[PDB]
Design a protein around this ligand. Structure first.
Ligand SMILES: [Cl-]
Ligand SMILES: [Cl-]
Ligand SMILES: [Mg+2]
Ligand SMILES: [Zn+2]
Ligand SMILES: [Zn+2]
Ligand SMILES: [Zn+2]
Length: 395
DNA sequence: GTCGTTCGCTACATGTCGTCGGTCTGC
DNA sequence: GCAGACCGACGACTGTAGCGAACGAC
């Protein structure tokens, strides 16, 4: 069976997240969005484990189900050097063992959903490998709390330890990450880092797995690519839409080149703020080869359907009009990805004509995109002639 | 034209832990 | 004067109450 899974979300116990991020709401929104699998997130926090055991029913010792949505145990932790890492746990026994194993290196493990571990990246990865916990650098290029902002290579961070994936992040896709030769041996994950269950947040990126059943072991085989199981697709936000795609200032969000950045010594002149290096420039720094492996699954860049609806209707992303149109699209059809990539534009025009024209413009790459940087998301705008012209003469 | 509804935007939170300036201090 | 301790503020890790103001079904 073919399932869409999002293995990186944060519960309401984490910081800077929404209080609505609870198991029932998450399951409802993932079901309405067409998301078959969602990682639990914050699994090290015992209160979130209690909420999971309450609001879910066991599929096996490591997979749970709530409101028809399956859930595997995932978590994100912060390094002694402020480097975020993602962990997938086989069973709840492994969750509890790893939790008790790191209580002597953390002070907020029972307090926050995203804990701070006073442990080296190598140490955390070794503790995960010993317990068969899958570990990988989460949002591995962001300039604030990533691996490649602190270290220059995966070996420099993990040393003799082993990692089982690399979360690409919003501002990256599989090709630019494959610009680093080591990554050719590593499976990619494209997750959402969801802090809100809203349309454009939960499942903004996901992984399309081929599995026999939706259980942790099947997902693990698919990530490793064994026994027929495989990650057959990597869907994600277009790299330009990300918060840190280009180098820009952290205060005024003015885009600077890498040359101008090193010239200004990372000081925004007309702002007085810290300018942070974009993930594109970082990858170009760490560039290794112009080649990339063939077994790599494709990466379908997508813009959130709610964002396209808000840009066509000329209204805010949270408005009731865009929410109503989004719900009508998700009722008439299956999922956001289907409406964005697979569905023919004539079928989209039955629900809304302007949205269909914008989706055609996004498919044909005739949609203006101002890239994001420094912490500001990229923006999508449509030309006038795309909206004022009919659909027949469009292509 | 009424007057509930919806919109867009600004301000603020909520704890740990870096970073990055400015300040004390002990020489 | 100066090295170096010390220190406070500031933002990532983003979401949303809540507040004038426009809207839009009577
Ligand atoms: Cl570095
Ligand atoms: Cl194996
Ligand atoms: Mg992406
Ligand atoms: Zn993170
Ligand atoms: Zn996260
Ligand atoms: Zn600036």
């Amino acid at each position: 069976m073919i399932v869409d899974g999002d293995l990186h979300i944060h519960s309401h116990y984490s910081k800077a997240v929404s209080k609505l991020m609870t198991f029932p709401i998450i399951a409802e929104n993932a079901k309405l969005k067409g998301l078959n699998l969602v990682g639990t997130g914050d699994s090290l926090n015992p209160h979130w484990e209690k909420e999971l055991l309450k609001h879910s029913k066991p599929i096996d010792d490591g997979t749970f189900e709530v409101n028809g949505v399956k859930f595997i145990l995932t978590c994100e932790v912060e390094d002694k050097r402020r480097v975020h890492h993602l962990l997938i746990f086989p069973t709840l026994s492994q969750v509890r063992e790893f939790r008790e194993k790191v209580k002597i290196y953390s002070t907020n493990i029972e307090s926050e959903g995203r804990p701070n571990l006073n442990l080296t990246a190598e140490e955390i990865a070794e503790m995960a490998n010993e317990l068969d916990i899958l570990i990988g650098p989460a949002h591995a290029f962001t300039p604030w709390t990533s691996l490649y902002k602190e270290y220059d290579s995966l070996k420099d961070a993990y040393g003799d330890a082993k990692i089982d994936f690399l979360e690409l992040g919003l501002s990256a896709d599989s090709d630019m990450a494959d610009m680093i030769k080591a990554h050719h041996s590593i499976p990619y994950l494209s997750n959402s880092n969801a802090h809100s269950p809203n349309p454009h947040r939960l499942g903004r990126e996901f992984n399309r797995f081929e599995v026999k059943d939706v259980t942790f072991e099947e997902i693990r085989k698919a990530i490793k690519g064994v026994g027929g199981r495989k990650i057959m697709l990597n869907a994600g936000l277009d790299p330009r839409l990300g918060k840190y795609h280009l180098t820009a200032c952290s205060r005024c969000y003015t885009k600077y080149t890498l040359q101008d950045a090193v010239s200004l010594s990372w000081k925004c002149p007309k702002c007085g703020g810290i300018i942070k290096k974009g993930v594109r420039d970082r990858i170009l720094e760490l560039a290794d080869t112009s080649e990339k492996p063939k077994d790599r699954p494709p990466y379908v860049r997508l813009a959130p359907l709610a964002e396209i609806i808000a840009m066509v209707l000329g209204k805010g992303i949270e408005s009731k009009a865009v929410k109503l149109l989004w719900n009508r699209f998700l009722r008439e059809f299956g999922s956001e990805i289907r409406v964005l990539i697979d569905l023919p534009i004539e079928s989209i025009a039955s629900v809304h004509e302007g949205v269909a024209k914008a989706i055609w413009a996004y498919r044909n790459n005739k949609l203006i995109i101002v890239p994001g940087g420094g912490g500001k998301y990229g923006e999508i705008r449509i030309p006038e002639e795309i909206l004022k012209a009919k659909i027949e003469d469009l292509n």
